[PDB]
Amino acid sequence: AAMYAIAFDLVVKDTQDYHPKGVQEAYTDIGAVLAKFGFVRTQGSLYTNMNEDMANLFQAMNALKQLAWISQSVRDIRAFRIEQWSDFTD
Amino acid sequence: AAMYAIAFDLVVKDTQDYHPKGVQEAYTDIGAVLAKFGFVRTQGSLYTNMNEDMANLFQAMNALKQLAWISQSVRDIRAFRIEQWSDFTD
C-alpha cells in the first residue's frame, strides 16, 4: 500500500575513479541509523517504511544530520510518500 | 507535486567484483528508451515524470521488455506514484 521512502547521494571526493566498496560501506552505515526507525533498504537505493507515522519519519531525519559524520559524507537527503508500487514481469 | 517513478536492478554476472562503468553504461542506455516518454533520472537511481498520465507510463513499460536486450540485462522493474518529495538541508 502506502509508504515513506528516504533517499540520498554520497559526497564524491574522487571524480576520476569509482569507489563502489566505499559506497556500499556508507549505505550499510546509514542503514544502521535508519533501521532504528523501521526504514530498511529496497533491492535498489531507497530506504522504505510502510509505517507512515510522520513522527517516526521526523525522528529518523533528526538522527541523520544530528550525526556530524552523516552531514560530512552525504550531499542530498530527500523523503517521498510512495502511494503505489507495482513489479513488472511482463 | 505528484509524479510517476520507474526503478530497476541490473542483472549481476560477476558477484566477485564491482563493474561501476558497466552499471553507468546500462543506466544511460535504459535512459535513452525512457527519455522518449518524459522519464528522466534523479540525482539518484529513479526515473521520474511529473506528467502522471497512465497511458504515457504504460507505453514507457511497453518500450521496456519489448526490447530483448532490456529483459536480458534487468532483473526487477517497478513503478511507484510519488505524492510528496522534500529536500532536507537541516
Side-chain angles (χ1 to χ4, degrees):
Chain A
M3 58 192 74
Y4 283 127
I6 295 160
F8 54 81
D9 311 314
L10 304 175
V11 174
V12 167
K13 312 273 188 189
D14 183 13
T15 59
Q16 194 171 13
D17 303 293
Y18 308 95
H19 297 284
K21 175 162 176 199
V23 171
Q24 199 183 331
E25 287 171 2
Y27 269 73
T28 182
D29 288 354
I30 287 155
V33 167
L34 282 186
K36 307 308 133 162
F37 307 94
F39 288 80
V40 83
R41 202 194 86 216
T42 68
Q43 203 78 78
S45 65
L46 296 186
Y47 284 81
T48 68
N49 195 343
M50 273 209 55
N51 170 39
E52 224 164 88
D53 186 59
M54 261 184 271
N56 185 65
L57 168 64
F58 152 106
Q59 56 184 16
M61 291 298 187
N62 276 333
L64 309 187
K65 234 218 100 197
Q66 164 116 295
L67 302 164
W69 80 266
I70 294 279
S71 322
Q72 81 188 11
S73 52
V74 81
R75 86 183 176 200
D76 300 318
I77 322 158
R78 63 198 83 113
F80 337 127
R81 184 159 55 70
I82 295 177
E83 282 304 310
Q84 300 193 248
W85 179 301
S86 312
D87 285 280
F88 294 70
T89 189
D90 34 290
Chain B
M3 58 192 74
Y4 283 127
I6 295 160
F8 54 81
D9 311 314
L10 304 175
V11 174
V12 167
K13 312 273 188 189
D14 183 13
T15 59
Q16 194 171 13
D17 303 293
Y18 308 95
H19 297 284
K21 175 162 176 199
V23 171
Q24 199 183 331
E25 287 171 2
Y27 269 73
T28 182
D29 288 354
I30 287 155
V33 167
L34 282 186
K36 307 308 133 162
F37 307 94
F39 288 80
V40 83
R41 202 194 86 216
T42 68
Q43 203 78 78
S45 65
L46 296 186
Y47 284 81
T48 68
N49 195 343
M50 273 208 55
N51 170 39
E52 224 164 88
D53 186 59
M54 261 184 271
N56 185 65
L57 168 64
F58 152 106
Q59 56 184 16
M61 291 298 187
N62 276 333
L64 309 187
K65 234 218 100 197
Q66 164 116 295
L67 302 164
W69 80 266
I70 294 279
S71 322
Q72 81 188 11
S73 52
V74 81
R75 86 183 176 200
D76 300 318
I77 322 158
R78 63 198 83 113
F80 337 127
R81 184 159 55 70
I82 295 177
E83 282 304 310
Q84 300 193 248
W85 179 301
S86 312
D87 285 280
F88 294 70
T89 189
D90 34 290

